[PDB]
Structure formats: structure tokens, C-alpha cells
Amino acid sequence: YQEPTDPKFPQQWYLSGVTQRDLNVKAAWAQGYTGHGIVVSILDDGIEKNHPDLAGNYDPGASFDVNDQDPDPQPRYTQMNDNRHGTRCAGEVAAVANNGVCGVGVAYNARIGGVRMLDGEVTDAVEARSLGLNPNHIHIYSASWGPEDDGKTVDGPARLAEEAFFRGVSQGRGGLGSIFVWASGNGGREHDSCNCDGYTNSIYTLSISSATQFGNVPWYSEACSSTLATTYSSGNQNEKQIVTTDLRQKCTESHTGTSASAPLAAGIIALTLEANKNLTWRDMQHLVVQTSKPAHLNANDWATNGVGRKVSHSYGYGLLDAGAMVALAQNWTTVAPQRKCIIDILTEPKDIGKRLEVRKTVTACLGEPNHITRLEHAQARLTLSYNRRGDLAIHLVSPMGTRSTLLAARPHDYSADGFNDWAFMTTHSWDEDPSGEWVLEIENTSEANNYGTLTKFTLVLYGTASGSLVPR
Ligand SMILES: CC(=O)NCC1CCN(Cc2cc(CN3CCC(C4CCN(C(=O)CN)CC4)CC3)cc(-c3cc(Cl)cc(Cl)c3)c2)CC1
Ligand SMILES: *[C@@H]1O[C@H](CO)[C@@H](O)[C@H](O)[C@H]1NC(C)=O
Numbered sequence: 001y002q003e004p005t006d007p008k009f010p011q012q013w014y015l016s017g018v019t020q021r022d023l024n025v026k027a028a029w030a031q032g033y034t035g036h037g038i039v040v041s042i043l044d045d046g047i048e049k050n051h052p053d054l055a056g057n058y059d060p061g062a063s064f065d066v067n068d069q070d071p072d073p074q075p076r077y078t079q080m081n082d083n084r085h086g087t088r089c090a091g092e093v094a095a096v097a098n099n100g101v102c103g104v105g106v107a108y109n110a111r112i113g114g115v116r117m118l119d120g121e122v123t124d125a126v127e128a129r130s131l132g133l134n135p136n137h138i139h140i141y142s143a144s145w146g147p148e149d150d151g152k153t154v155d156g157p158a159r160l161a162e163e164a165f166f167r168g169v170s171q172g173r174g175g176l177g178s179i180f181v182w183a184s185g186n187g188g189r190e191h192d193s194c195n196c197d198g199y200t201n202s203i204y205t206l207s208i209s210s211a212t213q214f215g216n217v218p219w220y221s222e223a224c225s226s227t228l229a230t231t232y233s234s235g236n237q238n239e240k241q242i243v244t245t246d247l248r249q250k251c252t253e254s255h256t257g258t259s260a261s262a263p264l265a266a267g268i269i270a271l272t273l274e275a276n277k278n279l280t281w282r283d284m285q286h287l288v289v290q291t292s293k294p295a296h297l298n299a300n301d302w303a304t305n306g307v308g309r310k311v312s313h314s315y316g317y318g319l320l321d322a323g324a325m326v327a328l329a330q331n332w333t334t335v336a337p338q339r340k341c342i343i344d345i346l347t348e349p350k351d352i353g354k355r356l357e358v359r360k361t362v363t364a365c366l367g368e369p370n371h372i373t374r375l376e377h378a379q380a381r382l383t384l385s386y387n388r389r390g391d392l393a394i395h396l397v398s399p400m401g402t403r404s405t406l407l408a409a410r411p412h413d414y415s416a417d418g419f420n421d422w423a424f425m426t427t428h429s430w431d432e433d434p435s436g437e438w439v440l441e442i443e444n445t446s447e448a449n450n451y452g453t454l455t456k457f458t459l460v461l462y463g464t465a466s467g468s469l470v471p472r
């Protein structure tokens, strides 16, 4: 195997490193996996399809302009180069290799397109038409953005966009399911808590956070239980950043944020899908859980779950490992059909006050076709009132003792609107048996005499009843 000769490949430290602080992509390339036959679309502000490092891989069938309602996602050029982000992300996935220009994509033989959908008013219809673009041609969608990262918003896909997610994972990709890769957010300095973003909090999105070059949690990171894994991105000014294609046929070394991590993940997922084109959308999440690596990622919340895997709310299961992903994909056995066990927990509304604990012992649909002994995602779907939402912290403890933070205190969130059947999701109990006692904790983290009521708590378990591995 001959590594790429591109002039900035040496600066792509998260791919070209020799110090074990990288995504282990060369190992996948040397196994023969470069993205050939895979199609990725960037949902963003457009794609410079004539960029010298993108044109060779550009796929019009992976592209559309929802903002102007035409097929051509070319960005709108402005003095401030506002609409450059999609071009930066596209190069991370699939910049051409060995062509003397900039660097390379993770999946440098994949085909790449873009949906121009952020340069205009983003409505539910715009979102749905983007998520549902050509779902039997595009394999993987990469989205780096969501509701405002102001630390006070709770929002997610409205009806058309949620229907697009369920159509995508159900009928997309020949019934194997569209793979939606999502950035978990850039709201760290606002103390944002990313389960309040219904796109990344979805079970249908494969959610990705960031690590700095020196292995730390970047200033912009949001912690939450819905994140699955991590890729490298930017940090402080002594740490390197992401090197990729830029608007006006240029090359940048200063692409940043969690919004630069999701495209790298999408590229790794493209390599993995080349290694086994029959992987379902759920198979892909299982591969990420099993192969991601905590080592050398610094956080104070690493905890071992019930099946022996280390998990963090900043990093999920750790750093994506492309070589390990493609190796495990090759002989992967398709997971069993997804079961869903619905448990209505409360017998009466519960005053929250300063603190509320709800304990319930469940059988996880014992005796029924939705019996789950092997969890995937779990949700606590909560309906509650409270006078100042951001003073709440919410935790969910599984029968195996795994504490998932569903919500951390958000100081800027002054809302009096509470949560209206909000489906807080955790990945941290993946592969655990969910039978037994679950504990929900709701706490007022402020000294204020805050007040409200929990009126509904639905525990929703997804998973299967076969195929478990010995714990790690
Ligand atoms: C009842 C009903 O109909 N509600 C409809 C709502 C419509 C809006 N939704 C949230 C939402 C709102 C938004 C737009 N917002 C404004 C700009 C934000 C930055 C500014 C910096 N920036 C650049 O500068 C680029 N050059 C990037 C963009 C992001 C936030 C985007 C999404 C979204 C959805 C999908 Cl699918 C994929 C993706 Cl990538 C992004 C999602 C929630 C539902
Ligand atoms: C894909 O997986 C399904 C489910 O196990 C199986 O029935 C089918 O034969 C597989 N297809 C290929 C091409 O391997």
C-alpha cells in the first residue's frame, strides 16, 4: 500500500499520524477500503462541485438545492465566504487522493454530493426534502448542525422531518436503512446539553462528538447520553485543526468544531459500508459501539457499563477506529429485527420540588414478541412542568447500575415551558439486559424554590433478544 502523496496529507494528523493519536484510517486503506461504490451527501450550505479536489468524486445524484429548488447545490458566493462549510465537509469525506491538490478524504474513492439547505429559511419541509433526498442512491448523510446551540433551546425534527427519518431507516438503501451521521453540537461555551437537540438525540442518527489533538474535551463540546462516538477536531491554538477543501478552490487548515467531526465519521462509515454493503443502519451503530476506543481521551466521567464497556457523555464509546470498523464489518452477522418495549411508569403525577426519584422494576415485555434482553437505545419520554427548565438535571439508572445523564443543568435556559413528551435517549446501556429496577432522578440544581410536576414517564426500550457477546 502507498499512502497518499497529496501536499497537505502530512498535515492531516488525524489520518496520517504515526503516534497512535489518529483515526486509524491508513489501516483500512491498506486492507483495500477507500470508499469505492459508496455515496455520501453533505446536508449544509452547498458544495463547490467544481473544486479541483472534489470534482473527480462529485455525484450530482447525491445533490440538490432545496433552498432555491433546483438540482445544483453550488454555494452562494459572498465577500465573507459564509457558504463554505459544506465544501469543507465534503472534502473531509471524499477529497480526491494523489492529485497534487490539498489533502485527501477519509473515503477518497467515495462519491460525494451536497444538499444546499442551510442558505435560506430552514422549515420542516426543507429538512424533510433534504433527509429524504434520493434514498436509494445516497448511502450516508452527514449533518453538522441542528437547533441553535444557545444552551436554551429544546427542539427537534417536526413531523415531516421525523417521517423522513423513519422512511429513511425503514425503506432507504434497499431496506437496509439510510445512515444519518450527526454532529452532537457546538454549544459547549453556552453549557448546552445535547439531548435537547432532537436530531442528535434521535436513535436514527449516529451521533459524533469531538476530541482535541492532545486528547481533551474541546471548549465547544456538548455532553449528552445520546452520543455514540468521537472523532478528532480542533482545540486550542497549540493544537492542530482539520485540513480540507475550501470555497473558491482553496485549501484550509482551520476547519473546526464538532461540525467538522461528523464528516470524518461519515467517511469512516463509508469505508465500513464498502467492507460490507449489507450492513443495516442498526448494524452500523453496533459496529461503532464495539470498535470505538476510549484510550487516551481525557474525561472525568468515564464509567464502565453493565457489559464492561467504558462510556463517557463527552465521547460516547470513544474514538472511531476505521481499521477495526472495516475488519469487524466483513463477517458481521445482521442483527435481529428491532423490538420496542413500551412501559408507562407512573401511576399518578409526581411533584418535583427540590428532588424527585422514581423507581420501577420492569420485565421488559417478558412473554411478548417485543421482549428485550439485549438493549440498544433506551428513552425516558418525559412530560413535565417546571418554572425554570435549565435548573433541572435528570439522570436515568439502568438495572445494571449504569447512570445516564439525560439532562444537565443549562444556566441560560430560563424557559417555563417544561418538556412535552421529550424522548431523552441514552446509548450507555447498549447490550445490557434491561429487566429489573430502573431509577429516574430529577433534581433542582439551584438554591431557588423551584416547582413543577412530572405527569408522564414512558420508558421505551429498543433492542433484541439474541446474539449477545461475552462482556468486555
Ligand atoms: C413546528 C415546525 O415546523 N418546526 C420547524 C423547525 C425548523 C428548524 N429545526 C431546527 C433546525 C434549524 C436549523 C437552522 N438553524 C439556523 C442556522 C444554524 C447555523 C448557522 C451557522 N451556519 C453557517 O454559517 C453555514 N455556512 C450553519 C447553520 C443552524 C440552526 C437547521 C437544522 C438542520 C436540519 C437538518 Cl435535517 C440538517 C441540518 Cl445540517 C440542519 C434544524 C427545528 C424544526
Ligand atoms: C443481507 O442480510 C440479510 C439478512 O441476514 C440476508 O437475508 C441477505 O441474504 C443478505 N444479503 C447479502 C447480499 O449478503
Ligand SMILES: [Ca+2]
Pocket (backbone or CB within 6 Å): 065, 068, 070, 071, 072, 073, 074
Ligand atoms: Ca442552485
Ligand SMILES: [Ca+2]
Pocket (backbone or CB within 6 Å): 006, 053, 095, 096, 097, 098, 099, 100, 101, 102, 103, 104
Ligand atoms: Ca487531493
Ligand SMILES: [Ca+2]
Pocket (backbone or CB within 6 Å): 147, 148, 149, 150, 184, 185, 186, 187, 192, 193, 194, 197, 222
Ligand atoms: Ca446543542
Ligand SMILES: [Cl-]
Pocket (backbone or CB within 6 Å): 340
Ligand atoms: Cl419507534
Ligand code: NA
Pocket (backbone or CB within 6 Å): 144, 145, 146, 147, 148, 149, 183, 184, 185, 186, 197
Ligand atoms: Na448544533
Ligand code: NA
Pocket (backbone or CB within 6 Å): 182, 199, 200, 201, 202, 203, 204, 205, 206, 207, 226
Ligand atoms: Na443520534
Ligand code: NA
Pocket (backbone or CB within 6 Å): 303, 304, 305, 306, 400, 401, 402
Ligand atoms: Na458500572
Ligand code: NA
Pocket (backbone or CB within 6 Å): 399, 433, 434, 435, 436, 437
Ligand atoms: Na435485570
